[PDB]
DNA sequence: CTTG
DNA sequence: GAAG
DNA sequence: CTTG
DNA sequence: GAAG
């Protein structure tokens, strides 16, 4: 099955991701920003448990890390950890955004491939590296009032809330695939940071890419959900659009 | 003095105004307009005695008339009788905007011409005519309580409040004026409906003139404020500019 | 929480 | 006077 | 009166 | 949600 054939590339069997062949990325800041640190507003006791162990995990992972640091960003509970990164953001210099819109991304399907495969990349973020020197600008306070731990801690991987956190992993996949599309000059693989679409001539072609579009993205260690995966079909959802005979 | 040598033209000695040489105006309608009565709204007491000594003279010049119409507009008080007309002129035909403004008229005034007489002409829509076939427009009512005179009245002359009247004033005006310009062609005469101002290059020639206008302007059946005159100097206040040594 |  |  |  |  396409399961227990590439243990490695799913989620659900290969572990968390880590993208081992991308350098930890350092993050520029404007010229002229200073570290800003930000007092956590009060959280009840409800959105604390609620939040404490997607943190156990996290730290467990070693995706969060014990900290201290001169900059500091609320948590909000939405329960799941939400981090107002807005006063970091407007510090951090501008990249150019290389995302394309889906509308363009989806102009280079052509007609004669029909047969796709999608793939949805799990905690795509969590999978690149951060600098240590770039670590202490995501920092956040963790306090367990009946475990008396109060201080920092932060984020050793891309976090969530960073405004340029989509463009750098879309970047570091291209980088990360460019082999593969040499080596399958007949596919096409459209990217759209965590959402792949492998699209093929033949369902034949469609298995081997598709296998081989596995092993790679395990091998390089980003991770593919396997309950949302869409193998193989001459129908698929990608990025809002129902995909069918060379509709939409 | 000036108020003695022309008793016809000034409107303290001359009597009401009448443009005998203009024919009664006929006001065309919009293609589609049918007649529209508006209920007068209940007048207090107060406003009523306020108005009333207006309404009485009004009728005795003949320049208000009782009628039967199947127009009607409101009186409102504000004491001095103001008619809404706003129904009335959304049902008359459009005509080309032609009275210049006060910025580019005052552009015709050449620096040769620093003496100056600005007259403003008194009552000066009611010097036009109305035909009788236009006077059921205008129609309003009026009801004194305490004398059992309730029924409509309606304008002869040219009214307060319709859109029309300025510039068919100003047109008027401009052809009952065209041959006094051709007679005195060393002279500026600017005209804005009611406000005139006559330019001349010496005092002498100024005093001429002002002679000759006010002796046509009155003949015409036009009155000029006495009060207000402004005769043959070298500073004038003219539509709201202050004229002086050939500045704004 | 704050930032038609 | 919805989003981090 | 009603029509920033 | 100032003007006739």
Redesign the pocket.
Known sequence: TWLSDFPQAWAETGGMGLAVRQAPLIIPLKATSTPVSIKQ?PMSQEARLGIKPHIQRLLDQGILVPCQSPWNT?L?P?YRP????????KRVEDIHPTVPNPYNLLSGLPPSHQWYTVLDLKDAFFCLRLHPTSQPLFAFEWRDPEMGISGQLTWTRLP????NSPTLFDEALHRDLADFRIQHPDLILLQYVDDLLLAATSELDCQQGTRALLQTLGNLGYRASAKKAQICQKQVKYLGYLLKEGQR
């Open positions: 507003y609320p909000l939405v939400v981090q107002d990164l807005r006063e970091v953001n969530q809330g960073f405004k």
